[PDB]
């Protein structure tokens, strides 16, 4: 779902917020994987690994169906859960997409989740892309 | 009136509704056609979640519009 990107922003693309210390879990995992700086721009969510290498990886904001927060219990700060529109195809394999699950989870190990969640919301609402 | 609901398998569901139908009632139709219990369903139009008590007209959902189903975690 993530594609390679140089990290530079396109011509009418602005940085909205950036945050160190964010890990990205896949579906319901709980040890894979990654740990790093998250960037939200007007068009994209861009990830960039700690010491580089490599990366960068980005998804378009138009790919996001819905977002929500999920509690860590009696911890400090919620995970942001991002639901993605599916790919397709392309004929032959396939198999079944129902047994695969279709969202990612952002955990904020160095905090700043509230601020990020708010910014992501506003970008989702305004669709400036 | 026909509306569409895209789910995250890529499946499009076609429903028969009227603008006066509550979201609760739409969710019920999905359980009828697809088997998903209303209580796990969430419905999104524009980018915002839709409220159970309210109607398709209240959200201005017209002929051929597309909602998106996203299940509860």
Swiss-Prot record, chain A:
Component of the ESCRT-II complex (endosomal sorting complex required for transport II), which is required for multivesicular body (MVB) formation and sorting of endosomal cargo proteins into MVBs. The MVB pathway mediates delivery of transmembrane proteins into the lumen of the lysosome for degradation. The ESCRT-II complex is probably involved in the recruitment of the ESCRT-III complex. Its ability to bind ubiquitin probably plays a role in endosomal sorting of ubiquitinated cargo proteins by ESCRT complexes. Belongs to the VPS36 family. This is Vacuolar protein-sorting-associated protein 36. Disulfide bonds: none annotated. The chain holds residues 3 to 131 of 386 of the full protein. Changing residue 65 to A: Reduces affinity for ubiquitin up to 10-fold. Component of a complex at least composed of ELL, SNF8/EAP30, VPS25/EAP20 and VPS36/EAP45. Component of the endosomal sorting complex required for transport II (ESCRT-II), composed of SNF8, VPS36 and two copies of VPS25. Interacts with VPS25, SNF8, TSG101 and CHMP6. Interacts (via GLUE domain) with ubiquitin. Interacts with RILPL1 (via the C-terminal domain); which recruits ESCRT-II to the endosome membranes. Interacts with ECPAS. The GLUE domain (GRAM-like ubiquitin-binding in EAP45) mediates binding to ubiquitin and phosphoinosides. It is found in: Cytoplasm; Endosome; Late endosome; Membrane. Residues 1-86 form the GLUE N-terminal domain. Residues 103-129 form the GLUE C-terminal domain. It comes from the Eukaryota.
Curated annotation (Swiss-Prot), chain B:
The record marks 68 as: Essential for function. It comes from Homo sapiens (Human). It comes from the Eukaryota. The record marks 54, 72 as: Interacts with activating enzyme. Phosphorylated at Ser-65 by PINK1 during mitophagy. Phosphorylated ubiquitin specifically binds and activates parkin (PRKN), triggering mitophagy. Phosphorylation does not affect E1-mediated E2 charging of ubiquitin but affects discharging of E2 enzymes to form polyubiquitin chains. It also affects deubiquitination by deubiquitinase enzymes such as USP30. Mono-ADP-ribosylated at the C-terminus by PARP9, a component of the PPAR9-DTX3L complex. ADP-ribosylation requires processing by E1 and E2 enzymes and prevents ubiquitin conjugation to substrates such as histones. There is a cross-link at residues 6, 11, 27, 29, 33, 48, 63 (Glycyl lysine isopeptide (Lys-Gly) (interchain with G-Cter in ubiquitin)). The chain holds residues 1 to 73 of 128 of the full protein. This is Ubiquitin. It is found in: Cytoplasm; Nucleus.
């Amino acid at each position: 779902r993530f594609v390679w990107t140089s990290g530079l922003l396109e011509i009418n693309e602005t940085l909205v917020i950036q945050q160190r210390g964010v890990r990205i879990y896949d579906g319901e995992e709980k040890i894979k994987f990654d740990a790093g700086t998250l960037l939200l721009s007007t068009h994209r969510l861009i990830w960039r690994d700690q010491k580089n290498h490599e990366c960068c990886m980005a998804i378009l904001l138009s790919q996001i169906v819905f977002i929500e927060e999920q509690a860590a219990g009696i911890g400090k700060s919620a995970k942001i859960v991002v639901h993605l529109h599916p790919a397709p195809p392309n004929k032959e394999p396939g198999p079944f997409q129902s047994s695969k699950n279709s969202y990612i989870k952002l955990s904020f190990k160095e905090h700043g989740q509230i601020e990020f969640y708010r910014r992501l919301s506003e970008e989702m609402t305004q669709r400036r892309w | 009136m026909q509306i569409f609901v895209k789910t995250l398998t890529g499946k499009t569901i076609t429903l028969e509704v009227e603008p006066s139908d509550t979201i609760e009632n739409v969710k019920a139709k999905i359980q009828d056609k697809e088997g998903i219990p209303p209580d796990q369903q969430r419905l999104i139009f524009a980018g915002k979640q839709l409220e159970d008590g309210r109607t398709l007209s209240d959200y201005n959902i017209q002929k051929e519009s597309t909602l998106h189903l996203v299940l509860r975690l």
